[PDB]
UniProtKB/Swiss-Prot annotation:
Participates in pre-mRNA splicing. Part of the U4/U5/U6 tri-snRNP complex, one of the building blocks of the spliceosome. Present with 432 molecules/cell in log phase SD medium. This is U4/U6 small nuclear ribonucleoprotein PRP3. It comes from the Eukaryota. The gene is PRP3. Component of the U4/U6-U5 tri-snRNP complex composed of the U4, U6 and U5 snRNAs and at least PRP3, PRP4, PRP6, PRP8, PRP18, PRP31, PRP38, SNU13, SNU23, SNU66, SNU114, SPP381, SMB1, SMD1, SMD2, SMD3, SMX2, SMX3, LSM2, LSM3, LSM4, LSM5, LSM6, LSM7, LSM8, BRR2 and DIB1. It is found in: Nucleus.
Length: 52
RNA sequence: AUUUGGUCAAUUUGAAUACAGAGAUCAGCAGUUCCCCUGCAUAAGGAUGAACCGUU
């Protein structure tokens, strides 16, 4: 249970996560260790693929 | 100088029959315990993956 809100798409936003403790821990791990947020990526659109 | 270490049992008896006394050998498999591997389940506990936006 929870959510992920954010401002203006590109802007800063909040994840809230709620549940059983193990699950929460797992989620945290995913957020921090597994995902690389600073990593570069590609946006796919009809006009052209935008490198970010 | 002599002699004991020498009684077959069993059965039929009121000595005769018996005659030494009645399964062997070879081979499987399973179980018992411990160990190792393998697949599955059960709990727990990780690790990780997967496009893209979601819900009043």
């Amino acid at each position: 249970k929870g959510l992920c809100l954010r401002i203006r798409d590109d802007g800063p936003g909040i994840i809230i996560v709620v549940g059983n403790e193990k699950s929460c821990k797992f989620y945290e791990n995913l957020v921090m260790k597994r995902i690389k947020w600073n990593e570069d990526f590609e946006l796919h659109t009809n006009t052209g693929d935008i490198k970010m």
